[PDB]
């Protein structure tokens, strides 16, 4: 083996280390996706935990490296680029509450929230997510109790009580994504309301993510 | 007595028969390769060490009710039955350490290379402590005649006990615990099921097991010194079989109820 | 772009420590393997140490074996040789080399200005066959160079390189692995030969081509140029 | 009035375009390659596991000299290889870790790779410093960049899911010409060896031939049910193979300006990720999202052997130009290279 | 009128396509037969190159 090969050699094993090297740093920061119509409130949880194509944050909350990857500018067809986020920790969903009367610009005969249904209906029962867990955030909380009393749940759902309060519509809307999810014993859907406190949204995200990370940790262990 | 032979003759086949499939499984499958396996796979692999390197050697023993080979190699024997019984143990304080480790500190078990140095440091610390422990029986710390070769020497003994079994069993009994504590108060939040309820069924069945099977050998060494009062023969021997059985029992209640590990049985037969 | 500017020395007393340090600047110092070669007043080069990219492995010549000590720090881009030990033998202009090792890499590539340490008072033999030839701008000229050994290695490839050093001036690699030229010289020279016994053809001199020709082999260590061809207009 | 007016008319031309291709469709290749011998088992071996990746492989491409070739990885690094040797060349650190494509250069200077960033990064390998730097960072696509082909060291094709192809310019940084014909995300690339065609199939079940001297859509091919994923070229330059989500590859020809074969079986229901070519074109590599590659005879039809050494499935697969092995890329992290053994 | 404009461009892309002249798929198939034939003793995944000559050895 002449000099230059094993020079060459060396230089690769000095790659390796690197290599090797970055993808410990990569296994320990956590990626999570995120879904959103683009209008309703992801955004503003954007640029609260902060404080074309995909957008990369990375923000630190405790002792824990969190990737977000805002991938709701593209409007091409999710089925041959999803399949790339197989291996993600939790998918943040971010669903405004105020789109439940509100119609969708593009057609206008369904409505947003129900457009937004769809979405979750394709992410939550796809074939790549049968063990990523997904947490749902309820944005526009604020506008949505102030909303409630002009205007009723009723126009969006052909059966519904007609309770027509913060405390139990909001309850019944989630219970609704929950019964979208088809598998209960994989993946768990943690659900909040998203409010204007800083701390809160990202506490809750940091806790997600350590429960979701519990389970698959106790599943490779065995004790599940 | 022939009829007793043929009993104990069944149980290493089973010894062998669950603890080859499981090794090769983990082999064959990148699923079966995580962090917490390799670890049972290092039980499974000390059993088979137990299965064959000692099994035939207690079998024969029996039979004859006399140790008619040579000295050294009754020394070699004993070296080996402690050792390997030992790491054994050891595996399971390592693997309750590893499962500790997964629900205390998550992001430590979480990462693939740090996981990965945690293995080869926790393996290295079985084997070799299990050796350091069975090293002055090589020499000759062993005191038996050479008619019958049983271990004579009571001090040693204790000191050995100790260490092998004693301490580990304090930190497996209590480390189960804190696991168990952990899982309860997070139901208990999560209410205010069926992952937690297996879980906590998994918890007793792993206890359980090593508490009828490994426990009573030992108490009875100390019960015996401290009364000064003579025991049967037949208790020392009952007892030292039924340890023995957890081998057989290892790779069911380890690999058998998790639910990736039954689609490697399926495959095999 | 690139500059390697070394300096340290020029007063030693035979017997003495003189460090020298190489300061780097303009590349990306850490992939690069450093060599450091010598050349003494009107002779030709030697190399003395080679440090890989992470100080992996250290190869040193067969004179300099437990005397000279080279150290590289790769944040501050900087490598030093801790020279010990001085002989009236170790007079001569050290020149900072860097290296890359790769599949078409150029090694020798870019090569340090040169600083003067002068003091008061087995392996392949790479020789030439003239050492002096007056020739004219414009006419082809075959520049020879025998080797011991043959340079053919299994994987197919020959390790014969040649640098052109101008009067007054610092050496440039202008072939390298006998066949391919490095970045930067016109393809007027041509490298030809097949096992030992090497030559170098350039089509048409010019101006910028006057000066002397080594023949390093790099099939395995220690490094050994040849006695350089003068070349006068 | 107008809306309806053309819409008849297309129906027209589209009636009036498939009765051509059934006239000139007198035999099929079925029938002039039964006289032929088979090509027999093709029995490769996997001769080098290139290993050093930590995420899944998403495309690899080769080089002129058969010797490196160049891996995309979801870790966010751009690893070119030595396949012979089995050591790193190089390891670009990315600045998008999402990279859907990677091609290398014919000459070996310049290294071309984008994804779900949308910014196909050229990276210049033969540097006059030591790491390999951004020459420029070609932007103006709105959908994933799906492939990145190279011309020559200037001119680089790009297919985009924002259903547009682009021929840009290195140099200026700027498309110079933007093939817009397709109404689904544009999914491969495939130059022919002329270097003046390229067909790219997308996910409105439709390959399109464009010239890169005019810039229109030469010829368009249909008869998939589902999403054309990756296509190459026979070596002529007049045959390309699509490969689809059906389990279907099918052999389009451009002068008899439609199918030829049809490589299905009725146990594999699964996607083709990659498509490839052998130097004479006999056999027709295939890789399949069941974790193995199966190797297809292009003139019979016959699956001639399985490459099935990878334990996840199989994303992008690629032969050499002088034919000698195929090497094809996993998303288990490693990049085995296969040969035929005599 | 964007679907107007859309339907203009599809209708004169197909009549560009159909002018195109298609030569038989017997004729076609045959040459592509021929170049296969051509280089059939070339190919090294087709007729597998002895280990000397192949660079990739175990
Ligand atoms: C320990 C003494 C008190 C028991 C003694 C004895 O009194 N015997 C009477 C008849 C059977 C025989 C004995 O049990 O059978 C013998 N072997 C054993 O009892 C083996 C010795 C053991 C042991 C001794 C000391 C420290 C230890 N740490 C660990 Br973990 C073990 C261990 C495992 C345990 N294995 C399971 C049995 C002979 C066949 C070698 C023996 O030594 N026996």
């Known amino acids: ?224 | 007595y022939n009829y007793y032979a043929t009993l104990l003759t069944l149980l290493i086949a089973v010894i062998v028969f669950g603890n080859v499939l499981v090794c090769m499984a983990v082999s064959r499958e990148k699923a079966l390769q995580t962090t917490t396996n390799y670890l049972i796979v290092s039980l499974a692999v000390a059993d088979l060490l137990v299965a064959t390197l000692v099994m035939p050697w207690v079998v024969y023993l029996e039979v004859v009710g006399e140790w008619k080979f040579s000295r050294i190699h009754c020394d070699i024997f004993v070296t080996l039955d402690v050792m390997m019984c030992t790491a054994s143990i050891l595996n399971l304080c390592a693997i309750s350490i590893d499962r500790y480790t997964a629900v205390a500190m998550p992001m430590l078990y979480n990462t693939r290379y740090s996981s990965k140095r945690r293995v080869t440091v926790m393996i290295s610390i079985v084997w070799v402590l299990s050796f350091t422990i069975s090293c002055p029986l090589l020499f000759g710390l062993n005191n038996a005649d050479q008619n019958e070769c049983i271990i004579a020497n009571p001090a040693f003994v204790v000191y050995s006990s100790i260490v092998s079994f004693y301490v580990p069993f304090i930190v497996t009994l209590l480390v189960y615990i804190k696991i168990y504590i952990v899982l309860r108060r997070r139901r208990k939040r999560v209410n205010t099921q069926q992952k937690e309820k297996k879980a906590t069924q998994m918890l007793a069945i792993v206890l359980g097991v090593f508490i009828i099977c490994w426990l009573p050998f030992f108490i009875t060494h100390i019960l015996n010194i401290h009364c000064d009062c003579n025991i049967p023969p037949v208790l020392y021997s009952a007892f030292t079989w039924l340890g023995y059985v957890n081998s057989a029992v290892n790779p069911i209640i380890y690999t058998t109820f998790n639910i990736e590990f039954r689609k490697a049985f399926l495959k095999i037969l | 772009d690139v500059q390697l500017v070394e300096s340290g020395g020029g007063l030693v007393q035979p017997g003495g420590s003189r460090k020298l340090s190489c300061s780097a600047s303009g590349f990306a110092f850490s992939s690069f393997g450093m060599h450091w070669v010598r050349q003494a007043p009107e002779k030709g080069l030697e190399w003395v140490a080679y440090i890989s990219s992470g100080s992996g492995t250290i190869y040193y010549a067969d004179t300099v074996k437990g005397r000279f000590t080279i150290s590289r720090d790769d944040p501050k881009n900087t490598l030093f040789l801790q020279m010990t030990s001085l002989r009236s033998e170790d007079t001569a202009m050290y020149y900072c080399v860097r290296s890359i090792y790769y599949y078409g890499s150029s090694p020798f590539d870019f090569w340090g200005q040169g600083t003067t340490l002068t003091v008061s008072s087995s392996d392949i033999v790479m020789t030439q066959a003239t050492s002096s030839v007056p020739v004219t701008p414009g006419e082809s000229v075959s520049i020879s160079c025998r080797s011991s050994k043959s340079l053919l290695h299994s994987n197919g490839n020959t390790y014969l390189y040649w640098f052109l050093q101008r009067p007054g001036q610092s050496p440039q690699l202008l072939i390298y692995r006998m066949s391919n030229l490095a970045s930067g010289v016109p393809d007027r020279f041509s490298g030809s030969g097949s096992g030992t016994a090497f030559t170098l053809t350039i089509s048409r001199l010019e101006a910028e081509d006057v000066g002397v020709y080594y023949c390093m082999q790099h099939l395995e260590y220690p490094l050994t140029f040849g006695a350089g061809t003068k070349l006068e207009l | 009035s107008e809306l309806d007016q053309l819409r008849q008319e297309a129906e027209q031309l589209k009636n009036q375009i498939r009765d051509a291709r059934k006239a000139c469709a007198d035999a099929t290749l079925s029938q002039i390659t039964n006289n032929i011998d088979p090509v027999g088992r093709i029995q490769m071996r996997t001769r080098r596991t290139l290993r050093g990746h930590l995420a899944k492989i998403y495309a690899m491409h080769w080089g002129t000299d058969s010797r490196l070739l160049v891996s995309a990885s979801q870790d966010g690094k751009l690893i070119i290889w030595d396949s012979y040797t089995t050591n790193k060349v190089h390891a670009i650190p990315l600045r998008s870790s999402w990279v859907m494509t990677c091609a290398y250069a014919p000459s070996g200077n310049y290294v071309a790779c984008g994804g779900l960033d949308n910014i196909c990064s050229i990276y210049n390998l033969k540097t006059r410093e030591g790491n390999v730097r951004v020459s420029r960072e070609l932007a103006g696509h709105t959908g994933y960049l799906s492939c990145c082909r190279f011309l020559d060291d200037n001119q680089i094709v790009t297919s985009s899911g924002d259903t547009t192809c682009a021929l840009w310019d290195i140099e200026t940084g700027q498309q110079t010409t933007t093939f817009t014909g397709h109404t689904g995300d544009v999914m491969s690339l495939s130059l022919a060896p002329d270097t003046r065609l390229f067909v790219s199939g997308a996910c409105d079940a439709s390959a399109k031939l464009w010239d890169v001297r005019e810039g229109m859509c030469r010829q368009t091919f249909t008869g998939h049910e589902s999403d054309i994923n990756a296509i190459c070229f026979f070596p002529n330059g007049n045959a390309f193979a699509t490969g689809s989500d059906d389990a279907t590859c099918r052999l389009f020809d451009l002068r008899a300006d439609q199918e030829l074969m049809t490589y299905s079986h009725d146990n594999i229901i699964c996607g083709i990720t990659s498509v490839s070519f052998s130097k004479s074109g006999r056999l027709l590599l295939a890789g399949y999202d069941d974790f193995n590659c199966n190797v297809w005879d292009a003139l019979k039809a016959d699956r001639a052997g399985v490459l099935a050494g990878h334990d996840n499935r199989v994303s992008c697969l690629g032969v050499t130009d002088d034919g000698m092995a195929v090497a094809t890329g996993s998303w288990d992290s490693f990049l085995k290279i296969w040969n035929g053994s005599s | 009128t964007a679907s107007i404009a859309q339907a203009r461009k599809l209708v004169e892309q197909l009549k560009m396509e159909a002018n195109i002249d298609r030569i038989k798929v017997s004729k076609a198939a045959a040459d592509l037969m021929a170049y296969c034939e051509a280089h059939a003793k070339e190919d090294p995944l087709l007729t597998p190159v002895p280990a000397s000559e192949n660079p990739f050895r175990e």
């Open chain 1, 1 to 224: 083996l002449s000099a230059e090969d094993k020079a060459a050699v060396e230089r690769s094993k000095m790659i390796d280390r690197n290599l090797r090297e970055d993808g410990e740093k990569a296994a320990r920061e956590v990626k999570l996706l995120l879904l959103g119509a683009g209008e309703s409130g992801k955004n503003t949880i954007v640029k609260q935990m902060k404080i074309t194509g995909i957008v990369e944050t990375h923000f630190t909350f405790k002792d824990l490296h969190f990737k977000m990857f805002d991938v709701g500018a593209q409007r091409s067809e999710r089925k041959k680029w999803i399949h790339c986020f197989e291996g993600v920790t939790a998918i943040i969903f971010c669903v405004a509450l105020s789109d439940y009367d509100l119609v969708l610009a593009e057609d206008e005969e369904m409505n947003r929230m129900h457009a937004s249904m769809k979405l979750f209906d394709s992410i939550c029962n796809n074939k790549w997510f049968t063990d990523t867990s997904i947490i749902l955030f309820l944005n526009k909380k604020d506008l949505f109790e102030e909303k409630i009393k002009k205007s009723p749940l009723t126009i969006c759902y052909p059966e519904y009580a007609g309770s027509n309060t913060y405390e139990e519509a909001a309850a019944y809307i989630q219970c609704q994504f929950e019964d979208l999810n088809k598998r209960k014993d994989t993946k768990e859907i943690y659900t909040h309301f998203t409010c204007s406190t800083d701390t809160k949204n990202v506490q809750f995200v940091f806790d997600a993510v350590t429960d979701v990370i519990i389970k698959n940790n106790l599943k490779d262990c065995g004790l599940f």
